[PDB]
Amino acid sequence: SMSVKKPKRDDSKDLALCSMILTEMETHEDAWPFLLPVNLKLVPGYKKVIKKPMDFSTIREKLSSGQYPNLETFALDVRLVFDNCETFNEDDSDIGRAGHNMRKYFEKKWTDTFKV
Ligand SMILES: COc1ccc(SCC(=O)Nc2c3c(nn2C)CCC3)cc1
């Protein structure tokens, strides 16, 4: 509360670490469904069903221009990619299984990096 400060973690490395984690995402072999925005004019239903589209390149752009206030908001956008993926794709599909794989990869890097 006012004048009652909780100890807070050093966050000066956060931007560098999120960038590294995102680079590992981008270079994973199953990252191809998520490297670029879903083409809303070639994929039927996507714009109507998916209210907040998100992809790695957009996350990279936002990270490079100071649009994430904290690492939490960064993880929110990453999770959004895989949540949109689950919403639209069957679990057995190539894209659908990619998102499960890629989600697990991220959450392990997230834990290993910030909960270490
Ligand atoms: C020409 O066929 C293509 C297949 C995959 C891609 S990759 C960009 C992309 O749209 N990925 C994606 C999709 C869905 N979810 N996600 C994440 C539903 C269907 C498409 C581009 C062209």
Curated annotation (Swiss-Prot):
Expressed at varying levels in several tissues, whereas a smaller transcript was expressed specifically in testis. It is found in: Nucleus. It comes from the Eukaryota. Residues 9-113 form the Bromo domain. Regulatory subunit of the ATP-dependent BRF-1 and BRF-5 ISWI chromatin remodeling complexes, which form ordered nucleosome arrays on chromatin and facilitate access to DNA during DNA-templated processes such as DNA replication, transcription, and repair. Both complexes regulate the spacing of nucleosomes along the chromatin and have the ability to slide mononucleosomes to the center of a DNA template. The BRF-1 ISWI chromatin remodeling complex has a lower ATP hydrolysis rate than the BRF-5 ISWI chromatin remodeling complex. Component of the BRF-1 ISWI chromatin remodeling complex, at least composed of SMARCA1 and BAZ2B, which regulates the spacing of histone octamers on the DNA template to facilitate access to DNA. Within the BRF-1 ISWI chromatin remodeling complex interacts with SMARCA1; the interaction is direct. Component of the BRF-5 ISWI chromatin remodeling complex, at least composed of SMARCA5/SNF2H and BAZ2B, which regulates the spacing of histone octamers on the DNA template to facilitate access to DNA. Belongs to the WAL family. This is Bromodomain adjacent to zinc finger domain protein 2B. It comes from Homo sapiens. The chain holds residues 2054 to 2167 of 2168 of the full protein.
